[PDB]
Amino acid sequence: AHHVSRNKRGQVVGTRGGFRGCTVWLTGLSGAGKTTISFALEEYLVSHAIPCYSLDGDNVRHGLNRNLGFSPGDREENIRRIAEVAKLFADAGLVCITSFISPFAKDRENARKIHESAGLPFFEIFVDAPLNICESRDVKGLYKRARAGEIKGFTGIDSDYEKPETPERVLKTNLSTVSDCVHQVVELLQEQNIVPY
Amino acid sequence: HVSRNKRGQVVGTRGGFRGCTVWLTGLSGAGKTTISFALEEYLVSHAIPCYSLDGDNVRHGLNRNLGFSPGDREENIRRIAEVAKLFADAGLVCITSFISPFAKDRENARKIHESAGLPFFEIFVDAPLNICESRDVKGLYKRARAGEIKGFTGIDSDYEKPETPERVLKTNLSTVSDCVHQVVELLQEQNIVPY
Numbered sequence: 196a197h198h199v200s201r202n203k204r205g206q207v208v209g210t211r212g213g214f215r216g217c218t219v220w221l222t223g224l225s226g227a228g229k230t231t232i233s234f235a236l237e238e239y240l241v242s243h244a245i246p247c248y249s250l251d252g253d254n255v256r257h258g259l260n261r262n263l264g265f266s267p268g269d270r271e272e273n274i275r276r277i278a279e280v281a282k283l284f285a286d287a288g289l290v291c292i293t294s295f296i297s298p299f300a301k302d303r304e305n306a307r308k309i310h311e312s313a314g315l316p317f318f319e320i321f322v323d324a325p326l327n328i329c330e331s332r333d334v335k336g337l338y339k340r341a342r343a344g345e346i347k348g349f350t351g352i353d354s355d356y357e358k359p360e361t362p363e364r365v366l367k368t369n370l371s372t373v374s375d376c377v378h379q380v381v382e383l384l385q386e387q388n389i390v391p392y
Numbered sequence: 393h394v395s396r397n398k399r400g401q402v403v404g405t406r407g408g409f410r411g412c413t414v415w416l417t418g419l420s421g422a423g424k425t426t427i428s429f430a431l432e433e434y435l436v437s438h439a440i441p442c443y444s445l446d447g448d449n450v451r452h453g454l455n456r457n458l459g460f461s462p463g464d465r466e467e468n469i470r471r472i473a474e475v476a477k478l479f480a481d482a483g484l485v486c487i488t489s490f491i492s493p494f495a496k497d498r499e500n501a502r503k504i505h506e507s508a509g510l511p512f513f514e515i516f517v518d519a520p521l522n523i524c525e526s527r528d529v530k531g532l533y534k535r536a537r538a539g540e541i542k543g544f545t546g547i548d549s550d551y552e553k554p555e556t557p558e559r560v561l562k563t564n565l566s567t568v569s570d571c572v573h574q575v576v577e578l579l580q581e582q583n584i585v586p587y
């Protein structure tokens with residue numbers, strides 16, 4: 196009695212043969228672009244017949260992580276539960292795109308060494324945009340509420356964002372287009388033999 | 393994101409959206425993990441992508457910080473039911489193989505799938521505690537009566553028989569292959585497994 200192999204799994208998940216289970220881990224300041232890259236990437240893989248799944252704020256915040264507030268331990272448990280689920284989707288044969296700020300190198304390496312110890316590729320993607328560009332963009336109003344003292348401890352304002360030193364890609368969203376950053380990430384997945392050339 | 397409409401075209405080779413949760417529930421040693429294994433081998437044979445949540449990939453991973461106190465079981469299932477919902481939303485057939493004895497935990501698990509629109513199949517693996525105790529596949533029934541395990545379900549914790557499940561499986565009264573086929577017929581009826 197055993198579970199089905201990743202090789203059999205690699206043959207039934209998509210129309211294109213081979214295991215592709217990996218995890219694409221976006222990280223960056225609120226408003227740097229993680230959501231917009233995630234859909235764009237997700238539309239790409241789907242349009243090219245690669246099943247994927249985004250984990251993001253909307254489908255985690257109020258489900259699996261609904262009992263997790265904004266204390267340091269709670270944001271930590273937040274990235275832990277996301278990481279163990281991303282591993283499961285990866286293990287399932289899918290490409291799992293996570294779009295969480297994840298400000299501390301120390302939770303990101305734990306997520307990475309959760310994947311690497313199951314033999315699953317892990318791609319730290321640094322969505323890099325100057326904080327003042329993020330504060331200008333203010334997509335959800337958060338920076339204005341952080342200045343005002345109504346959001347206490349906000350990444351980039353009152354708690355730090357530890358920038359990836361050694362990530363597989365860096366996306367300079369203040370300098371290039373959405374399509375351009377996606378090309379950087381699709382090309383990564385072609386090198387690592389996830390997306391066929 | 394990409395709708396379930398378009399995920400049905402890329403996930404699997406069979407065409408159509410199939411995302412759902414087969415949720416096996418019943419006594420420790422009643423055949424949940426056996427059915428989950430054989431059903432998995434069935435769907436992968438028929439080219440239906442799937443994924444199992446069992447004790448192994450959960451106990452020490454996602455739910456590693458959950459004890460065996462009442463709040464912690466509620467949470468155990470709560471987190472499992474959320475992850476099933478994700479794998480179901482993704483276009484996979486998620487199979488869960490936990491005792492999950494309390495009925496409100498199961499009602500909550502179903503609520504989470506239906507409100508999102510995902511099919512939830514409650515599958516009662518049914519075998520008399522005596523046979524399950526007799527089978528004692530892991531040693532737990534032998535430890536439990538001694539008191540090595542306190543609160544074990546069937547001994548010092550109750551088990552709440554699901555009263556309107558989509559299937560009951562007489563693991564003491566029919567073969568693994570018969571019980572798996574009962575689940576296949578339920579999934580063919582609901583346009584999850586092609587004919």
Ligand SMILES: Nc1ncnc2c1ncn2[C@@H]1O[C@H](COP(=O)(O)OP(=O)(O)O)[C@@H](O)[C@H]1O
Pocket residue numbers: 223224225226227228229230231232294322332334367368369371372373374376
């Ligand atoms: N190259 C780019 N990549 C991603 N987003 C960009 C880019 N250029 C401009 N933007 C804009 O930046 C904002 C990113 O917001 P969002 O994706 O919600 O950030 P986060 O990555 O924090 O979720 C969007 O308004 C998007 O239109």
Ligand SMILES: Nc1ncnc2c1ncn2[C@@H]1O[C@H](COP(=O)(O)OP(=O)(O)O)[C@@H](O)[C@H]1O
Pocket residue numbers: 418419420421422423424425426427489527529562563564566567568569571
């Ligand atoms: N119809 C059946 N379905 C599943 N298991 C069965 C059946 N009939 C007998 N068994 C036996 O019962 C035992 C079930 O144990 P297990 O699958 O570990 O159950 P659980 O996951 O509920 O603990 C196995 O040894 C299996 O061979």
Ligand SMILES: Nc1ncnc2c1ncn2[C@@H]1O[C@H](COP(=O)(O)OS(=O)(=O)O)[C@@H](O)[C@H]1O
Pocket residue numbers: 225251252253255256270294295296297298337348349350354
């Ligand atoms: N350490 C943190 N400090 C402040 N806000 C956070 C932190 N972590 C996450 N957020 C906020 O989290 C929401 C995004 O979804 P979450 O699942 O809560 O976490 S997040 O990491 O992506 O940001 C947005 O409201 C996000 O901007």
